[PDB]
Amino acid sequence: PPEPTIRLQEDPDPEDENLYEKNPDSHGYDKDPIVDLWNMRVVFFFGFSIVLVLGSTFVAYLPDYRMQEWARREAERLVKYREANGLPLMESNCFDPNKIQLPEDED
Amino acid sequence: NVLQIVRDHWVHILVPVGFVFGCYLDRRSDEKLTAFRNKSLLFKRELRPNEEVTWK
Amino acid sequence: ARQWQPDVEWAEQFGGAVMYPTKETAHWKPPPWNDVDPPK
Amino acid sequence: MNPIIYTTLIMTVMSGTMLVMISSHWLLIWIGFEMNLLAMIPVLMKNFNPRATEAATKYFLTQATASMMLMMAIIINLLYSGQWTITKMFNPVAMTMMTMALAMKLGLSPFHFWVPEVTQGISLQAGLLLLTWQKLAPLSVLCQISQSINPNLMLTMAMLSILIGGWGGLNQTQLRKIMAYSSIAHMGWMTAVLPYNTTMTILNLLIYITMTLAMFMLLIHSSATTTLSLSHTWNKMPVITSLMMVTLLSMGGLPPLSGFMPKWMIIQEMTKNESIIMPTLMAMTALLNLYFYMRLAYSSSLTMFPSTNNMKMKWQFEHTKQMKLLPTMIVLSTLVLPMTPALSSLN
Amino acid sequence: MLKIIIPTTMLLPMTWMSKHNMIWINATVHSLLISLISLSLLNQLGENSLNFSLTFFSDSLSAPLLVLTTWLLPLMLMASQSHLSKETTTRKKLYITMLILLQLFLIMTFTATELILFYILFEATLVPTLIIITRWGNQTERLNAGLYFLFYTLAGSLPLLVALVYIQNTTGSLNFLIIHYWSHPLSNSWSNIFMWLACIMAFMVKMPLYGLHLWLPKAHVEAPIAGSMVLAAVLLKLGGYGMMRITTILNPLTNYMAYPFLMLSMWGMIMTSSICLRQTDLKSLIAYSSVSHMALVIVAIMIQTPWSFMGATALMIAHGLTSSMLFCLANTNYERVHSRTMILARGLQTLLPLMATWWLVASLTNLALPPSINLIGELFIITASFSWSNITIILMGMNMMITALYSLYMLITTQRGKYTHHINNIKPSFTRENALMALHILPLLLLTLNPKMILGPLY
Amino acid sequence: MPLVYMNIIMAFAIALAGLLMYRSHLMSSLLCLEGMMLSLFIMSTLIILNTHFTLANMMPIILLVFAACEAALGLSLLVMVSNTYGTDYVQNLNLLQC
Amino acid sequence: LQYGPLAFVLGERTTRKLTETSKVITVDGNICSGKGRLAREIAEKLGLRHFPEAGIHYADSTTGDGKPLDVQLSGNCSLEKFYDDPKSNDGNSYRLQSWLYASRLLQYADALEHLLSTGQGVVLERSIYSDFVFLEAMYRQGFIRKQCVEHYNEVKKVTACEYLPPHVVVYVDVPVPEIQSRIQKKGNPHEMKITAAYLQDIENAYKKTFLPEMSEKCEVLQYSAREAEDAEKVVEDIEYLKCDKGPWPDQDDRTFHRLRMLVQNKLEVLNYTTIPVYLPEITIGAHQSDRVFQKFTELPGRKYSPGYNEDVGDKWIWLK
Amino acid sequence: SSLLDLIWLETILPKTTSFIQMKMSIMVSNQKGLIKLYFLSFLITIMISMTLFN
Amino acid sequence: PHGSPDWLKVGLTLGTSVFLWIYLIKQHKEDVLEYKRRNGLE
Ligand SMILES: CCCCCCCCCCCCCCCCC[C@@H](O)O[C@H](CO[C@H](O)CCCCCCCCCCCCCCC)COP(=O)(O)OCC[N+](C)(C)C
Ligand SMILES: CCCCCCCCCCCCCCCCC[C@@H](O)O[C@H](CO[C@H](O)CCCCCCCCCCCCCCC)COP(=O)(O)OCC[N+](C)(C)C
Ligand SMILES: CCCCCCCCCCCCCCCCC[C@@H](O)O[C@H](CO[C@H](O)CCCCCCCCCCCCCCC)COP(=O)(O)OCC[N+](C)(C)C
Ligand SMILES: CCCCCCCC/C=C\CCCCCCCC(=O)O[C@H](COC(=O)CCCCCCC/C=C/CCCCCCCC)COP(=O)(O)OCCN
Ligand SMILES: Nc1ncnc2c1ncn2[C@@H]1O[C@H](COP(=O)(O)OP(=O)(O)O)[C@@H](O)[C@H]1O
């Protein structure tokens, strides 16, 4: 059996390279220190500073397009009106029955 | 340096330009949906003396 | 540490005359590299 | 052969197809079919080897039997009504004879057996011609007489063709046989919408021709006829393999690729006619075609197969001959889904 | 809506015209800016919707998903920067192109006023994910995984298309607004039962449903980190969004047809939580946890009550964020140990204390610790189920207990105990990994301050 | 449709079946196509003569010519196949398979 | 007008270019011999074009700039290592043999292209025919395995079945003792180690198989060391004989058009040199293949097509 | 983990589909290339087609 | 190989593009004018 046991021509599996070895203060972004530092800076500025803080403040101060206070004020004046006139607060019918035409059964 | 970093940073301007173009296209598409402007029963409003359209 | 890529044994699955070899079709042979058969 | 003779034979094949397409007399349609068959054989036998001769003789036997059946249908139709114009047949028996003749000419199941063998025997350019240009005349005749066809028989043959193509492609390592089974499945898709809308038939035909042209030209460029030969292309032309993978994805019917346009439309059309079960089965069966397209993509571009040492020499040379329409074919076969309503042009 | 779509498209020429060593920086910066711009969709109305045009519309169900989709891309780029170092510029540009195309398809899918357009984009998302899995995955099983992730999906999605066109042949339209306003009851018929099944099964397979979940562990385990992040965070939510949209035409047939799926989900959450207790792989455990959470979301959508829908929306957002964080932590361990076996690298608290804190907070959010939005969705769904039937409380509480058990088991196995002696290549955590972890976790604890942003249209 | 037409039709059917049998001897296959065309010629001539349709008196001859041309090609093919094997047996044409 | 079907249609015919002087000829000789000198002398005397014997980097001389590339990018084999350690574990012997056969195929294609396009004949050293003798030697000495010889036979059949063999072959006969004496007189340290058994086996192959098989389809001129010194007699022998037994007289204008299309487009010439047969000596894994292909692409004039390389100095790129 | 997830759920949907498609593909694509059998099937199909429809 | 930018091909390509664009602009102009005249707009 003169076979080589080498099934094919293959490069050996390379060993993983440490970014801290050639460069302490390596930030884990790139092996080029300048590109590494600027990648860290842009990620931190546009992620933590711009989006995370300014966007959160923008969401906090969004105008009331859901009309929560509007509904509260409408309910307040409506309850004030019905309590003053003795009306039974909320009605059980959502629509007026006079304007609904039921089908006569005659069963 | 001008005329040198432009050849290396020209790509950066593209995303911002797209945002402006998209805003313009959104407004242009808005201009084609005015069939009911100042005609809804909820917001039938009489125009101000120096007004052309209620909204743009 | 390295992404797996097909070896020779993986490639030889696709080297037969047909896929999914059977007892009847085992004796089949792949065609010649150029579509020429010896005139015998 | 001589380039003059080759050009003459190609124009004779095209003139036969044209004769079939422009005539209103059944005799002239039969003559166009005869002319096409007569000029097609040397094209299949352009490169001489025993396999090409076998493919040509099988193709001739099939097409001549189909022509005799078609002439029998014509004569029976004349017997029951002295008419020569291609229109509604007026005879139940004649229509069946005509339908079987055209199914044999197209390669629809159960008359599919000749397509894989003929495609494997002939070269890649001959296969391109056989799978693209040789479907126009029978499909045009079918479109002209679509109001006559029995929907049961046409739909049975369409579903059988889809099933047979899907199952037969799963077992192939040869690229030409894969193309043949794909063509059988696509013919099955095309003929299932003839009873309802011939415009959808023509749209499917155009999309299929575009994709088949792109795939054959890519296979000719990277001169491979087997899976393992195609697995070597990434080590010389990776961009060709990427384009081939995208084209294969399109041929499997994935959105938003162009190959999704026909089936979708066809399904949509078949739903307007209260046909629900049949399109469902057709799509489920097309999943098989997608499976073997995906296997080819895995073997070609999504993984890197081992190469050989002599490939290094091939790194030093570039193609002398180029296809001008290959980029256009790729783009038209991958990125025309947004232009779907243009099908109103009655393509 | 074009003010978000056009910049995402411009991400492609910018990526392909970039320097060889500026692709990550430019992609990250402009994706973050696109996320910031998309953040202004959160200003929703109490009335109908944000109907931008005939093609695209926004809703308070769509807006949180859109914002999460836009926020996920920068994190995916940061996670992918490490393991793509030794690869050519063209291939890295192709990888970033696949991510950008996935984001574009997801963005157009979530707005998608048309149901056929929604289907087309919802199936177009399939291609980039498949290419990412089967091209940049490590093990030999990835190809097989891809096949599963493909065919399952299509096996569910092909009938839906037929159903969809059928509806437009009868109703005359597939616009969601017209469908909602012109909706009519479904009679109890065999044809209507099969229409219901064709409408539901496509979204059920991608949640995934318990019986139909086989593709998920394979696809998530064999995918690269960006692929796993996008699969767990956004792609699983397509089924929930589609069900929430499509259940408007399925009433009142949902009352009868929901029972087998309700039983499957209620038992499968227990089954998958129990499976998590015996798992030798971190990624598989996280995948099964995702299956359990999505089973709870399926129950919520099937009950179809207001509290159910609010809980399901909150849980979808919270699960996306938490699962992305967990996958990132697992990948940080893997890139050091190269094994992905949970029992191998032990006692990592003594060597990586800040990463241990990140692990703890991720496990806490997965455990649904109040007042996190995870527990907000959990509790809303549980209360809705209790109103649906008081006996669901046993299964829900058992699921909670097992969830806490396997989350703390995962934390204790990897972080506590004694370090493995023979492993000496555990390097200090990079600033990139810590920044990634914070960018996952701060949005969760900051969303717990404003829950109405992620509670959906029925708030 | 009288008995002569049905006799010619069944002759065509017999020729077609004989072609579809393929016992051996591809020459026999060519002969079966040939009998098919002969039956076609006979029945078309009978139909055209009976109805006194003067112009289609052309088409039988034309049919013959075209079919005859086809026959020539087939013979060539047969000959060439024999040149590879020494016989025109059908079973030798199994190099190409499904 | 690059040659194609249209040129053939309009005017381009090569039967008129043949002026009974073309006579594609090849020279065969033992390792270290006068065949090179004799081939050159025949080339100047007969007015033919001489083709120096193909080496590892013959293909490098015809593409890009003629300067050879690195061993890792061109050949991945060396003759010196084969001489030093012919029984290597990494399979250098058969890789060398296969690369040399592919180089000889490319050189034969170039020679045929020149002869058919110009009408001027060519002179060659060891061609694709008689390249097998070394293979046989390597098998009889045990330098390579058998599966190597089946693979070589397959490639040689599929490739050489499409070209015209040379009109007349010139063989210089040299005994082994004198061949070894000349090897020692050269002073090359690596050629010092060629065992006499290898030379004798190589010699046996030419006489036993190569001579009779070329005698029945071509014309053979057996010469010795003394009679190979005077090229006048050799040229006279070439002139006197007339080639009428080979396939060349049976060739015509359309077959010449087909052959001229084949000899151009070197990718189709080398098409079957990389058939997917996985022999460990020649098959290369995906990682090494990708790395070496990336290295080859980064070469100065190799990223794009020859006219589209800026670093070399091609101008007007944006208008080509 | 094993009985249901790794065995029976695999056996039911994916493995069954793969097995059935495998067997059907083997049955469909296994023709020896003899045109005698092909045209015998052609006669059969043609005969069946004429009779069933009418 | 070693070839100059073929100014004949370049000129023909530019000429074809310019001719097509000019033809398209003209065709659009008479299309608009014909539509306006037929529909009685202006
Ligand atoms: C996949 C892309 C396919 C593209 C197709 C090839 C593109 C190049 C074609 C070159 C120009 C073609 C125009 C032909 C000039 C004159 C046309 C005239 O002769 O034909 C008319 C009609 O021409 C064609 O119908 C129009 C062809 C246009 C095809 C485009 C539609 C494809 C579907 C949308 C896919 C997106 C493609 C667009 C991107 C390029 C009248 O036909 P008619 O004699 O009365 O009836 C025959 C047809 N019937 C029987 C069905 C009724
Ligand atoms: C290190 C040790 C600690 C040091 C630091 C000590 C200080 C701690 C104080 C901070 C935490 C304590 C909690 C106290 C909260 C105070 C602020 C809070 O009250 O404001 C909230 C306001 O904040 C927002 O509601 C929440 C922020 C929204 C988060 C958006 C996420 C950012 C985008 C990132 C991408 C998205 C990824 C996830 C996709 C879904 C709620 O206010 P609200 O009563 O309601 O109305 C706002 C004011 N109005 C009345 C005028 C309207
Ligand atoms: C595998 C992993 C999970 C995948 C997804 C699983 C979910 C699919 C479950 C399907 C939902 C229910 C299907 C049918 C529900 C109808 C109600 C039925 O179950 O009850 C009886 C139905 O009776 C019987 O079921 C009749 C059908 C019997 C045949 C069914 C086969 C039984 C087992 C098949 C299960 C296999 C599922 C997977 C297939 C590949 C009531 O009879 P009746 O009141 O009179 O008629 C009611 C229907 N009407 C009103 C429209 C007329
Ligand atoms: C993960 C893999 C799952 C695979 C798919 C699962 C979903 C299966 C759902 C059914 C598929 C096709 C349904 C049709 C699509 C809707 C169209 C429709 O509703 O129209 C019906 C048509 O209804 C049908 O035709 C249904 C026929 C179904 C045939 C295919 C059966 C597939 C398997 C059946 C058993 C399993 C069913 C549920 C499986 C769930 C997935 C496990 C009524 O229309 P008409 O008939 O025109 O009007 C009535 C008057 N004539
Ligand atoms: N097919 C081959 N196999 C092995 N070695 C070869 C082959 N072809 C040429 N060579 C080597 O090329 C070298 C030079 O060839 P040769 O003519 O004998 O010497 P020189 O160039 O001085 O005349 C020799 O050492 C020979 O071994």
XYZ file of C-alpha atoms in Angstrom, chain E residues 22-450:
429
model
C -14.514 51.443 5.485
C -17.454 49.145 4.704
C -18.275 48.312 8.330
C -18.010 51.922 9.534
C -20.145 53.386 6.747
C -22.735 50.609 6.924
C -23.054 50.899 10.706
C -23.304 54.702 10.730
C -25.889 54.948 7.973
C -27.941 52.017 9.282
C -28.034 53.740 12.679
C -29.196 56.951 11.002
C -31.906 55.022 9.141
C -33.012 53.553 12.478
C -33.180 57.055 13.959
C -35.288 58.269 11.023
C -37.609 55.254 11.262
C -38.081 56.011 14.964
C -40.546 58.769 13.978
C -43.126 56.209 12.820
C -43.969 55.605 16.500
C -46.229 58.694 16.533
C -49.395 56.710 15.851
C -53.060 57.662 16.052
C -55.989 56.424 18.057
C -57.891 56.366 14.763
C -57.393 54.156 11.704
C -53.749 54.291 10.602
C -50.946 56.205 8.892
C -52.054 55.674 5.296
C -49.119 57.095 3.351
C -50.248 56.044 -0.128
C -52.122 53.351 -2.037
C -49.166 50.983 -1.544
C -47.839 51.507 1.995
C -49.518 52.185 5.329
C -48.318 52.204 8.925
C -50.002 50.939 12.067
C -49.114 50.743 15.733
C -48.613 47.018 15.192
C -46.310 47.637 12.214
C -44.318 50.540 13.679
C -42.573 48.678 16.558
C -41.651 45.841 14.195
C -40.284 48.339 11.665
C -38.205 50.107 14.315
C -36.839 46.803 15.629
C -35.980 45.735 12.074
C -34.087 48.976 11.459
C -32.316 48.718 14.821
C -31.246 45.111 14.252
C -29.030 45.813 11.226
C -26.269 47.799 13.029
C -26.091 45.123 15.725
C -25.873 42.419 13.058
C -23.020 44.291 11.368
C -21.160 44.665 14.674
C -21.623 40.955 15.381
C -20.486 39.970 11.873
C -17.364 42.170 11.869
C -15.357 39.607 13.844
C -15.722 36.274 12.037
C -15.545 37.818 8.533
C -12.054 39.273 9.048
C -10.161 36.755 6.882
C -12.470 37.096 3.874
C -12.202 39.077 0.658
C -13.697 42.530 0.163
C -16.141 41.377 -2.524
C -17.548 38.611 -0.323
C -17.917 40.911 2.695
C -19.707 43.407 0.451
C -21.967 40.564 -0.699
C -22.727 39.642 2.925
C -23.625 43.246 3.755
C -25.714 43.333 0.571
C -27.658 40.283 1.750
C -28.318 41.956 5.100
C -29.455 45.183 3.399
C -31.759 43.282 1.032
C -33.260 41.409 3.979
C -33.941 44.707 5.762
C -35.491 46.222 2.636
C -37.806 43.252 2.107
C -38.826 43.231 5.784
C -39.543 46.975 5.762
C -41.704 46.696 2.659
C -43.381 43.579 4.093
C -44.475 45.258 7.313
C -46.223 48.140 5.491
C -47.538 46.333 2.404
C -51.139 47.605 2.178
C -51.850 44.788 -0.324
C -52.084 41.148 0.734
C -50.467 39.879 -2.482
C -47.663 42.425 -2.117
C -47.315 41.289 1.490
C -47.085 37.672 0.318
C -44.516 38.512 -2.363
C -42.218 40.351 0.051
C -42.920 37.853 2.850
C -41.592 35.158 0.511
C -38.836 37.367 -0.928
C -37.282 37.489 2.539
C -36.629 33.756 2.086
C -33.800 34.111 -0.466
C -31.315 36.319 1.476
C -31.700 34.201 4.616
C -31.134 30.970 2.687
C -28.028 32.373 0.991
C -26.657 33.639 4.319
C -27.251 30.275 6.005
C -25.907 28.062 3.213
C -22.940 30.280 2.264
C -21.476 31.656 5.510
C -22.408 28.858 7.920
C -19.642 26.727 9.387
C -20.758 23.122 9.828
C -21.693 20.643 7.106
C -25.328 20.492 8.287
C -26.021 24.057 7.109
C -27.034 22.896 3.624
C -29.495 20.446 5.155
C -30.721 23.183 7.486
C -31.272 25.483 4.532
C -33.336 22.850 2.754
C -35.582 22.501 5.788
C -35.881 26.256 6.238
C -36.885 26.439 2.596
C -39.392 23.696 2.060
C -41.342 23.903 5.309
C -41.935 27.568 4.500
C -43.106 26.895 0.963
C -45.123 23.886 2.100
C -47.140 26.359 4.139
C -47.022 29.320 1.788
C -48.093 27.839 -1.551
C -51.716 27.112 -0.470
C -52.010 30.627 0.982
C -51.326 32.192 -2.417
C -54.165 30.170 -3.928
C -56.484 31.194 -1.102
C -55.428 34.811 -1.535
C -56.238 34.973 -5.232
C -59.476 33.103 -4.566
C -60.513 35.810 -2.111
C -59.874 38.560 -4.639
C -61.917 36.643 -7.203
C -64.862 36.710 -4.791
C -64.409 39.895 -2.753
C -62.919 41.932 -5.606
C -60.037 43.344 -3.567
C -57.196 42.335 -1.277
C -56.522 45.780 0.198
C -56.416 45.452 3.974
C -58.578 48.524 4.610
C -61.288 47.361 2.189
C -61.069 43.843 3.629
C -61.496 45.160 7.174
C -64.410 47.448 6.301
C -66.216 44.944 4.037
C -65.597 41.832 6.149
C -68.309 39.166 6.277
C -68.784 36.027 8.391
C -67.513 32.635 7.249
C -70.174 29.934 7.237
C -69.322 26.553 8.757
C -68.565 24.697 5.528
C -65.878 22.316 4.315
C -64.782 24.820 1.665
C -64.574 27.541 4.314
C -62.678 25.184 6.640
C -60.070 24.586 3.949
C -59.891 28.308 3.158
C -59.253 28.891 6.873
C -56.503 26.264 6.879
C -54.884 27.718 3.753
C -54.926 31.162 5.370
C -53.511 29.994 8.723
C -50.953 27.266 8.002
C -48.459 29.535 6.208
C -48.125 31.797 9.243
C -48.294 28.840 11.635
C -45.242 27.156 10.130
C -43.029 30.231 10.635
C -43.982 31.004 14.244
C -43.299 27.977 14.369
C -46.165 25.802 15.550
C -45.079 23.071 17.945
C -45.561 20.160 15.554
C -44.085 22.162 12.669
C -40.995 23.510 14.440
C -38.364 21.054 13.167
C -36.742 23.541 10.786
C -36.065 26.165 13.465
C -33.399 24.422 15.613
C -31.432 23.416 12.517
C -31.702 26.808 10.819
C -30.806 28.776 13.951
C -27.961 26.471 15.026
C -26.213 26.271 11.644
C -26.626 29.939 10.751
C -23.945 32.592 11.360
C -24.527 35.109 14.154
C -26.229 37.720 11.961
C -28.443 35.020 10.484
C -29.447 33.734 13.915
C -30.140 37.281 15.120
C -32.376 38.129 12.168
C -34.112 34.728 12.278
C -34.994 34.971 15.965
C -35.751 38.692 16.153
C -37.771 39.615 13.038
C -38.365 36.597 10.803
C -40.297 34.648 13.446
C -42.628 37.631 13.914
C -43.787 37.565 10.284
C -46.151 34.712 11.114
C -47.617 36.568 14.078
C -48.066 39.766 12.079
C -49.691 37.841 9.233
C -52.075 36.038 11.577
C -53.025 39.304 13.278
C -53.790 40.764 9.858
C -55.596 37.763 8.366
C -57.817 36.666 11.268
C -60.228 39.478 10.346
C -61.791 37.397 7.553
C -61.822 34.115 9.454
C -64.528 34.918 11.999
C -66.566 33.207 13.334
C -64.874 30.037 12.076
C -61.851 30.740 14.303
C -63.907 29.702 17.348
C -64.057 26.083 16.177
C -60.865 25.914 14.123
C -58.622 27.293 16.872
C -58.893 24.248 19.152
C -56.208 21.942 17.639
C -53.715 24.806 17.367
C -54.515 25.982 20.894
C -53.910 22.482 22.263
C -50.735 22.108 20.199
C -49.336 25.408 21.476
C -50.352 24.941 25.118
C -48.789 21.477 25.284
C -45.804 22.323 23.082
C -44.725 25.217 25.267
C -44.385 22.725 28.133
C -42.676 20.217 25.839
C -40.107 22.696 24.499
C -39.430 24.265 27.898
C -38.771 20.742 29.186
C -36.532 20.069 26.176
C -34.474 23.125 27.146
C -33.649 21.492 30.496
C -31.774 18.685 28.709
C -29.740 20.423 26.004
C -26.023 20.055 25.319
C -25.853 23.039 22.933
C -26.416 26.696 23.817
C -27.894 27.671 20.446
C -30.353 24.767 20.481
C -31.504 25.737 23.978
C -32.079 29.336 22.868
C -33.952 28.100 19.786
C -36.275 25.922 21.868
C -36.892 28.848 24.219
C -37.908 30.854 21.148
C -40.311 28.060 20.195
C -41.924 28.225 23.651
C -42.351 32.008 23.556
C -43.852 31.865 20.069
C -46.231 29.134 21.242
C -47.486 31.604 23.835
C -47.867 34.226 21.089
C -49.846 31.719 18.992
C -52.216 31.133 21.906
C -52.639 34.895 22.278
C -53.456 35.421 18.598
C -55.874 32.478 18.518
C -57.824 33.785 21.531
C -58.282 37.087 19.601
C -59.204 39.396 22.470
C -57.812 42.915 23.008
C -55.591 41.878 25.918
C -54.393 38.904 23.865
C -53.321 41.147 20.986
C -51.580 43.669 23.245
C -49.717 40.902 25.060
C -48.729 39.257 21.785
C -47.293 42.490 20.371
C -45.347 43.214 23.559
C -44.052 39.641 23.742
C -42.967 39.650 20.094
C -40.863 42.785 20.590
C -39.419 41.628 23.917
C -38.597 38.152 22.618
C -36.867 39.568 19.557
C -34.570 41.721 21.673
C -33.898 39.060 24.325
C -33.205 36.228 21.871
C -30.862 38.407 19.816
C -28.934 39.251 22.995
C -28.760 35.591 24.041
C -27.481 34.499 20.628
C -24.850 37.243 20.744
C -23.647 36.065 24.168
C -23.458 32.472 22.949
C -21.466 33.608 19.911
C -19.038 35.592 22.066
C -18.340 32.385 23.975
C -18.114 30.359 20.747
C -15.592 32.638 19.030
C -13.280 31.948 21.983
C -13.898 28.240 22.527
C -14.983 27.133 19.000
C -17.125 24.316 20.421
C -20.700 25.513 21.104
C -21.023 22.834 23.815
C -22.462 24.333 26.984
C -20.631 22.066 29.445
C -17.157 22.688 28.012
C -16.327 26.277 29.018
C -17.317 26.713 32.663
C -16.919 29.305 35.390
C -16.645 32.265 33.030
C -17.721 34.722 35.744
C -14.252 34.588 37.300
C -12.635 35.428 33.947
C -15.273 37.684 32.306
C -17.213 39.548 35.021
C -18.880 42.185 32.821
C -19.893 39.520 30.312
C -21.277 37.632 33.316
C -23.392 40.684 34.155
C -24.656 40.734 30.563
C -25.481 37.022 30.838
C -27.368 37.672 34.076
C -29.469 40.499 32.645
C -30.260 38.516 29.489
C -31.334 35.523 31.587
C -33.435 37.841 33.759
C -35.304 39.249 30.765
C -35.741 35.751 29.319
C -37.043 34.678 32.746
C -39.688 37.456 32.444
C -38.778 39.448 35.545
C -41.160 42.365 36.207
C -41.566 45.092 35.221
C -39.909 44.047 31.955
C -41.965 44.090 28.770
C -41.393 40.335 28.559
C -43.518 39.934 31.675
C -45.987 42.574 30.461
C -46.746 40.485 27.385
C -46.620 37.237 29.366
C -49.124 38.487 31.950
C -51.503 40.034 29.423
C -51.625 36.776 27.459
C -52.028 34.748 30.665
C -54.920 36.904 31.891
C -56.640 36.681 28.506
C -56.221 32.894 28.543
C -57.600 32.727 32.089
C -60.695 34.597 30.931
C -60.885 32.190 27.976
C -60.710 29.219 30.369
C -59.607 29.056 34.000
C -57.730 25.773 33.491
C -55.046 27.375 31.294
C -53.434 28.670 34.492
C -51.879 25.266 35.249
C -50.088 25.083 31.902
C -49.094 28.758 32.019
C -47.636 28.523 35.524
C -45.811 25.308 34.699
C -44.316 27.022 31.656
C -43.214 29.964 33.802
C -41.556 27.644 36.320
C -39.727 25.613 33.671
C -38.657 28.810 31.890
C -37.058 30.144 35.063
C -35.466 26.737 35.652
C -33.784 26.463 32.260
C -32.757 30.135 32.142
C -30.963 29.860 35.478
C -29.577 26.451 34.489
C -28.054 28.069 31.403
C -26.618 30.898 33.508
C -25.195 28.642 36.247
C -23.667 26.071 33.880
C -21.705 28.617 31.837
C -20.870 31.343 34.368
C -20.594 29.673 37.781
C -18.561 26.855 39.263
C -14.878 26.340 38.478
C -13.102 27.377 35.289
C -11.973 24.640 32.929
C -8.242 24.201 33.452
C -7.074 23.266 29.960
C -8.758 26.270 28.328
C -6.261 29.140 28.367
C -7.354 31.214 25.333
C -10.187 33.149 27.023
C -9.160 36.703 26.127
C -10.634 39.822 27.759
C -13.926 40.988 26.298
C -13.618 43.501 23.472
C -15.290 46.903 23.483
C -17.264 45.786 20.422
C -18.913 42.899 22.285
C -19.759 44.987 25.356
C -21.198 47.737 23.153
C -23.281 45.140 21.303
C -24.621 43.775 24.588
C -25.532 47.226 25.908
C -27.196 48.150 22.611
C -29.341 45.042 22.984
C -30.275 45.513 26.615
C -30.801 49.265 27.163
C -33.718 49.425 24.657
C -35.589 46.777 26.700
C -35.222 48.443 30.100
C -35.978 51.770 28.440
C -39.107 50.468 26.703
C -40.457 49.323 30.052
C -40.888 53.057 30.780
C -43.225 53.615 27.790
